């Protein structure tokens, strides 16, 4: 049942992972193995919460993101308790921590997209960036670029993983670059983009189904970015809707 | 001292009108100034959905006459206020009536002037103290009868002046003043994108080891 | 005068009493092994003051000096000074304010010092910030104002008028519609009784003339205060006085008492735009019907743009705006600066016509 549970966690069926992790949690005869299984249970719970999404619905996005963060934080507390001097679990804690940081970057981004509907156009003083939303999405640049750098640092510091784990880390880093480019092409200086994705967007190796769905999401978001390039006002609401749909598309693929 | 309900702060997070509609009167009055800036301002959003969403926002805005009062708060020329605040800023770097008495017997612009001046005083006293949790007995914040329009005008200057009132600085500054955790509650309630970076700021610029300090 | 007193009294152990009585009350207000001796001396001083006010040795001079000192310490701008004067007056003599209502009238020399206390509390009404303290002060004034003096009663009426007008936040808190208290109802009834007895005295600056022929040289702020008290509605305890004032100043099918200027002899507007807006805000139908007459289209747009108004008031304002459209449409159209905004505003007034038809065109 432990092998079945970890196979389900590998593929993406996190509900059966939840149930078998419950079964393991009642079981087992040591401290840190118990904490490890509790952490895996909490991760499966947050990932089922992430599977419970609906397209073009930002309310459910905020709700399910908050549930995913709280279950991941119970899980990362369990992982920190599970760490041992003999087996210093370092990949797991960093991967979970950067996953938490990615979902909070997504949460700040989605509520920042909500801020245009929750604040003025700027102020009575402003009448080429006007409003607090420009500073907020500049902070989004800082957070997402730092997060991509931290994904790169996790990639470089492992050296002991296989091709699939490294490629998954590359998928997460490419998601961070995707959101960063999508924002800095829509709102923050459209003028010097001038690219329209002059590289290949097809004929991939596709070594896993998760890779293929990640690449399809990446290509769709880049298509939306190319189409919505320099037609509309710099703030816009098609821009915020594009970010919202991008975040939903990233969080749909589990 | 009544703190805003968590459901109201979610409804501000959720940016939906149907949960704002099913909300009690003092909660609406406490959440007001953001909502009236959402109502009487140029449309930041141009969507056809935000049309009837804004229509329903202004639909529930009636009641509480003090709305009109803070409409006066959004009725002044603000450029003179920001030049005056900047001139006071370089002045600091180089009143016959009491605080409550001047606070009541006044119109909007000099109320704005006094509140921005004392925010400048609390901010540069933070810059002067450098670590020690200093005590200031600013009367208009102790002021148990006059608190809600003070939170209103704090929200107004917070949503007017983006650069001259930075978020984390004003947040810690009103942490140092008297009983204004509810002031910070209002300041993070009115602008929904404030809670996580105010959490960041309060985590850095404080004590490290001993929570038993003042 | 707090900190130098604090570091002078505490540094002078041998002079805790001092022969003048004013210094005795000063040290009592400062006080409000060593701590036990200080408490015993404070108790002895309290007993001496109680003998000097309620005992057989109570003369007029010492009582007047003590209470005048307490009242002049109440007048200090700092709230802590008024708190200390509160503590001293409560220790020597609305459960927390029962000394002013019950213990103070039991004094043997109550008349002259009661008039002095009434004048001092009228001066404190200029400055007090606590609503319940102002409520107790108004109750004591309504129960113990010297009615015989015309100048003192007119000063009382003017002070209550200034309290209502310039400190409307205090009465707004005291007339919170969420929690209507019985003490607030009693305070409203007391203020209505004060205005009613002022009017009963006078009827038996602006020149006001009634439809019955009576004349007045009053202050317009008193009129503002009493018409705001009229908008507060009938009190739950008493109803005859409120209906009497409503019938006198807003009589049924009769013209209103007109206003006039004392100095330059001109007609003055008794109901300004903000006052008429608050009349429309009121739930009394007679006040709204009185405010309906003589409304400009610009004033109509100003009144409609406001919020917090009852539903039937928007309805009748909508038919009055339709009547204004039917009278002069071109001037009202020229007063329109954004057709979409007022068209939408009228659409809001609908579900809470001719004017909307003009706006859509």
DSSP string, B21-41: HS--HHHHHHHHHHHHHHHSS
Q: Return the residue matching tokens 């607090």.
A: A132
- A235 vs B contacts (CB less than 8 Å): 44
Please name the residue of chain C whose CA is at the shortest distance from the CA of residue B54.
Answer: C344
- The values of phi and psi at residue B59, to 5°, are -65, -40
> DSSP class of residue C219?
-
Q: What angle do CA B210, A73, A86 make, to 5 degrees?
A: 80
Sign, Cα dihedral of A228, A231, A233, A237: negative
> Mutate which of C76, C127, C129, C172 to test chain B, going by most B C-beta atoms within 10 A?
C129
Contact B159, A124 (CB under 8 A): no
Where are the strands (E) in chain C, listed by range? 206-209, 215-218, 258-261
Cα separation, C29 vs C23, in Å, equals 10
> DSSP class of residue C310?
-
Cα separation, A46 vs A74, in Å, equals 10
| 3-state DSSP assignment of residue C213 | coil
Q: Which two tokens stand for residue A230?
A: 């320099």
Question: Chains B vs C: touching, with 3+ CB pairs under 8 Å?
Answer: yes
> DSSP class of residue C178?
S
Q: Return the residue matching tokens 């001719």.
A: C354
CA-based nearest distance C198→chain B, Å: 27
Q: How many CB atoms lie within 10 A of CB B149?
A: 18
Cα separation, C70 vs B55, in Å, equals 57
What was the structure determination method? cryo-EM
Residue A148, classified by CB atoms within 10 Å of its CB into exposed (0-12), middle (13-18) or buried (19+), is buried
The CA-based dihedral angle spanning residues B126, B128, B131, B135, taken in that order and rounded to the nearest 10 degrees: -60
> DSSP class of residue C356?
H
Q: Which two tokens stand for residue C21?
A: 């009585």
DSSP string for residues in C180-209:
--HHHHHHHHHHHHHHHHHHHHHH--EEEE
Q: Return the residue matching tokens 């020149």.
A: C207
Q: Is A234 on the interface with B (CB under 8 A)?
A: no
Cα separation, A122 vs A135, in Å, equals 12
CA-based nearest distance B145→chain C, Å: 7
Q: Is C164 on the interface with B (CB under 8 A)?
A: no
Q: Would you report the helix, strand and coil content of chain A in percent, each value rounded to 5? A: 70, 0, 30
Q: Return the residue matching tokens 């600091």.
A: B92
Q: Is A229 on the interface with B (CB under 8 A)?
A: no
User: Nominal resolution in Å?
Assistant: 4.1
Residue A178, classified by CB atoms within 10 Å of its CB into exposed (0-12), middle (13-18) or buried (19+), is buried
Q: What is the CA radius of gyration of chain C?
A: 27
Cα separation, C73 vs C82, in Å, equals 7
Contact C353, C318 (CB under 8 A): yes
Q: Which are the contacts of A147, defined by CB distance < 8 A and separation ≥ 6?
A: A98, A101, A102, A105, A176
Q: Is A111 on the interface with B (CB under 8 A)?
A: yes
Are B159 and A62 a contacting pair at CB < 8 A? no
Q: What is the CA radius of gyration of chain A?
A: 20
Q: Is B96 on the interface with C (CB under 8 A)?
A: no
DSSP string for residues in chain B:
--PPPHHHHHHHHHT-HHHHHS--HHHHHHHHHHHHHHHSS--S---HHHHHHHHHHHHTT-S-THHHHHHHHT-S-SHHHHHHHHHHHHHHH---S-HHHHHHS--HHHHHHHHHHHHHHHHHHHHHHSSS------HHHH-SSS-HHHHHHHHHHHHH-TTTS-HHHHHHHHHHSSS-HHHHHHHHHHSSTTHHHHHHHHHHSS-SS-TT--
Q: Of C289, C314, C319, C311, which is closest to residue C303 (Cα–Cα)?
A: C314
> Mutate which of B25, B97, B104 to test chain C, going by most C C-beta atoms within 10 A?
B104
Residue B63, classified by CB atoms within 10 Å of its CB into exposed (0-12), middle (13-18) or buried (19+), is middle
Q: Partners of C215 in the beta sheet?
A: C209
Contact C191, C142 (CB under 8 A): yes
Q: Which are the contacts of C234, defined by CB distance < 8 A and separation ≥ 6?
A: C242, C243
Q: Is C72 on the interface with B (CB under 8 A)?
A: no
Q: Partners of C218 in the beta sheet?
A: C206
Closest in C127, C178, C308 to B26, CB measured: C178
Cα separation, C129 vs C174, in Å, equals 12
Helix (H) or strand (E) holding C241: helix C240-249
Cα separation, C249 vs C257, in Å, equals 7
- The values of phi and psi at residue C197, to 5°, are -75, -30
Cα separation, C108 vs C91, in Å, equals 18
Q: What is the CA radius of gyration of chain B?
A: 18
Contact A137, A183 (CB under 8 A): yes
Closest in B55, B67, B143 to C308, CB measured: B67
| 3-state DSSP assignment of residue C133 | helix
Contact A78, A96 (CB under 8 A): no
Contact B5, B27 (CB under 8 A): yes
Contact C91, C32 (CB under 8 A): yes
Q: Of C310, C198, C217, which is closest to residue C265 (Cα–Cα)?
A: C217
């Amino acid at each position: 049942v432990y092998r079945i549970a970890r196979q389900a966690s590998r593929m993406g069926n996190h509900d059966m992972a939840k149930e078998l992790y419950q079964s393991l949690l009642t079981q087992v005869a040591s401290e840190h193995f118990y904490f490890w299984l509790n952490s895996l249970k909490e991760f499966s719970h947050a990932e089922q919460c992430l599977t419970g999404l609906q397209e073009e619905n930002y309310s459910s996005a905020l709700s399910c993101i908050a549930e995913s963060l709280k279950f991941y934080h119970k899980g990362i507390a369990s992982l920190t308790a599970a760490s041992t001097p003999l087996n210093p679990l370092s990949f797991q804690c960093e991967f979970v921590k950067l996953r938490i940081d990615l979902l909070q970057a997504f949460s700040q981004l989605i509520c920042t997209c909500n801020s245009l509907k929750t604040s003025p156009p700027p102020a009575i003083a402003t009448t080429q960036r006007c409003g607090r939303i420009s500073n907020q999405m500049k902070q989004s640049m800082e957070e997402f670029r730092s997060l991509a750098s931290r994904y790169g640092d996790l990639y470089q510091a492992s050296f002991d993983a296989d091709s699939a784990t490294l490629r998954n880390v590359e998928l997460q880093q490419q998601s961070c670059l995707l959101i960063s480019h999508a924002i800095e092409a829509l709102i923050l200086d459209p003028e010097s983009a001038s690219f329209q994705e002059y590289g290949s967007t097809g004929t991939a190796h596709a070594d896993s189904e998760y890779e293929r769905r990640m690449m399809s999401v990446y290509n769709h978001v880049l298509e939306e970015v190319e189409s919505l390039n320099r037609k509309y006002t710099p703030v816009s609401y098609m821009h915020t809707a594009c970010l919202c749909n991008a975040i939903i598309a990233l969080l749909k693929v589990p | 001292l009544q703190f805003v309900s968590p459901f109201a702060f979610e409804a501000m997070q959720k940016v939906d009108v149907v949960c704002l509609a099913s909300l009690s009167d003092p909660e609406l009055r406490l959440l007001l100034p953001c909502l009236v800036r959402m109502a009487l301002c140029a449309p930041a959003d141009q969507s056809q959905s935000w049309a009837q969403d804004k229509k329903l926002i202004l639909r529930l805005l009636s009641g509480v006459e003090a709305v009109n009062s803070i409409v006066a708060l959004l009725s002044v020329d603000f450029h003179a206020l920001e030049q005056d605040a900047s001139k006071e800023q370089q002045l600091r770097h180089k009143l016959q009536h009491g605080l409550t008495l001047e606070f009541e017997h006044s119109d909007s612009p000099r109320r704005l002037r006094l509140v921005l001046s004392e925010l400048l005083a609390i901010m540069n006293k933070v810059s002067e103290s450098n670590g020690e949790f200093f005590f200031k007995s600013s009367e208009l914040f102790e002021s148990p009868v006059y608190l809600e329009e003070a939170a209103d005008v704090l929200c107004i200057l917070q949503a007017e002046l983006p650069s001259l009132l930075p978020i984390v600085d004003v947040a810690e500054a009103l942490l140092h003043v008297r009983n204004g955790a509810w002031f910070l509650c209002l300041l993070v309630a009115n602008v929904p994108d404030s809670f996580n970076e105010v959490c960041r700021g309060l985590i850095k610029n404080g004590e490290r080891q001993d929570e038993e300090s003042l | 005068s707090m900190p130098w007193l604090a570091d002078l009294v505490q540094s002078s152990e041998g002079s805790l009493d001092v022969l003048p009585v004013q210094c005795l009350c000063e040290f009592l207000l400062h006080d409000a092994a060593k701590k036990r001796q200080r408490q015993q001396k404070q108790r002895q001083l309290l007993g001496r003051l109680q003998d000097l006010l309620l005992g057989p040795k109570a003369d007029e001079q010492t009582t007047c000096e003590v209470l005048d000192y307490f009242l002049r310490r109440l007048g200090s701008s700092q709230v802590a000074s008024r708190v200390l004067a509160m503590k001293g007056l409560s220790l020597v003599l609305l459960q927390g304010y029962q000394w002013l209502l019950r213990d103070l009238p039991r004094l043997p020399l109550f008349d002259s010092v009661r008039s002095t206390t009434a004048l001092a509390l009228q001066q404190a009404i200029h400055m007090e910030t606590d609503p319940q303290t102002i409520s107790a002060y108004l109750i004591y004034l309504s129960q113990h104002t010297p009615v015989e003096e015309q100048a003192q009663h007119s000063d009382l009426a003017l002070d209550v008028a200034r309290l209502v007008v310039e400190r409307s936040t205090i009465m707004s808190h005291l007339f919170s519609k969420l929690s209507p208290s019985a003490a607030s109802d009693a305070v409203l009834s007391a203020l209505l009784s004060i205005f009613s007895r002022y009017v009963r005295r006078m009827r038996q600056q602006v020149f006001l003339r009634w439809s019955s022929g009576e004349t007045a040289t009053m202050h317009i702020l008193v009129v503002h205060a009493m018409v705001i008290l009229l908008t507060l509605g009938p009190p739950r305890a008493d109803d005859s006085e409120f209906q009497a004032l409503l019938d006198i100043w807003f009589p049924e099918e009769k013209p209103l008492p007109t206003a006039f200027l004392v100095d330059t002899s001109e007609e003055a507007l008794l109901l300004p735009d903000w006052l008429k807006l608050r009349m429309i805000r009121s739930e009394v139908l007679r006040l709204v019907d009185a405010a309906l007459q003589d409304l400009e289209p610009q004033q109509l747009l100003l009144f409609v743009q406001s919020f917090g108004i009852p539903v039937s008031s928007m309805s009748k304002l909508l038919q009055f705006l339709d009547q204004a459209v039917a009278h002069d449409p071109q001037t009202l159209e020229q007063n329109i600066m954004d057709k979409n905004y007022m068209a939408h505003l009228v659409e809001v007034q609908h579900e809470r016509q001719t004017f909307h038809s003009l706006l859509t065109a």
